[PDB]
């Protein structure tokens, strides 16, 4: 009985962990997207002038 309730708590923790992991992934990808976009928006004069 004790083992089964421990296992249940463990599995619920696992599910919460997966939700947290996917949230982290989305945050990181959005951060990278914003970084790319800012880098691109910075080099626009150097593009329209030189290249």
């Amino acid at each position: 009985l004790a083992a089964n309730r421990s296992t249940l708590a463990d599995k619920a923790a696992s599910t919460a962990a997966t939700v947290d992991a996917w949230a982290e992934r989305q945050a990181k990808m959005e951060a990278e997207l914003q970084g790319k976009e800012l880098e691109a928006v910075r080099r626009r004069p150097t593009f329209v002038l030189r290249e």
Partner: protein, 252 residues
């Protein structure tokens, strides 16, 4: 064992406690609750209570939810509230920020009955305008976190760690004692009941012949709960202006 409180039985058992609704509103509820429950995608939706107003258009408040889960030692119900002033058309009762929660907590008196009204508060002189529906939501939240009564061990935890009805519930052994009841947000098997509340904030009257217990809140006078033990049903209702009773120490 019931699966959801029945508004007919609630209004029948708690009518002696003065918790009544108009006849037109009773019929209108009988039609409107299923419509809103379906078109909101909710598994449960019931009449939570009725708050009196100064212009005679009392607010009926309904509460619904889909599933309850155990988080951080609490049985959290992702509840959603709706209000109405005729019993036929339900509108949303949107949550309120934490900063505004304090301000609406400072507003007292019977509500106006005009959802477009807004009260004024003054601070260091910065004036805030608080909409009436904010005050209504805050009063409902306070009353809900205070009472939310169910019988003890009527819920249970399942494999997915969700709080579900205990369909093998046999009933409260001693229905006239506060140990037989608990808050909704207490996990099953946690041993926390209404007897752990501040002593003197609950009253229990038990008719041992018919088997009907009535639990009244004295901290929020107007919250009534009933438990019928021969048919294993139960349910609660709030009726009143929504203000807490702060003079309780002088009234006991």
């Amino acid at each position: 064992v019931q699966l959801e409180p029945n508004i007919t039985l609630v209004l029948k058992h708690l009518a002696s406690c003065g918790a009544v609704v108009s006849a037109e509103q009773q019929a209108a509820l009988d039609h409107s609750i299923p419509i809103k429950r379906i078109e909101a995608g909710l598994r449960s939706l019931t009449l939570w209570g009725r708050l009196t107003t100064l212009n005679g258009k009392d607010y009926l408040v309904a509460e619904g939810y889909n599933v309850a889960s155990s988080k951080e030692g609490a049985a959290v119900y992702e509840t959603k509230y709706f209000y109405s002033q005729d019993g036929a058309r339900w509108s949303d009762l949107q949550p309120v920020d934490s900063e505004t929660a304090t301000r609406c907590a400072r507003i007292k008196g019977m509500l106006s009955g005009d959802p477009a009204k807004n009260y004024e508060l003054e601070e260091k002189p910065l004036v805030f305008q608080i909409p009436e529906l904010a005050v209504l939501r805050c009063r409902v939240d306070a009353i809900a976190t205070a009472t939310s009564v169910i019988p003890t061990d009527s819920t249970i935890l399942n494999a997915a760690s969700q709080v579900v009805p205990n369909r093998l519930f046999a009933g409260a052994a001693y229905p006239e004692k506060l140990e037989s009841y608990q808050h909704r947000f207490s996990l099953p098997g946690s041993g926390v009941t209404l007897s752990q509340d501040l002593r003197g904030t609950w009253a229990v009257q038990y008719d041992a012949f018919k088997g009907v217990a009535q639990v009244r809140s004295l901290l929020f006078p107007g919250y009534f709960f009933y438990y019928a033990a021969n048919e294993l049903t139960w349910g609660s209702l709030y009726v009143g202006d929504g203000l807490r009773n702060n003079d309780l120490i002088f009234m006991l």
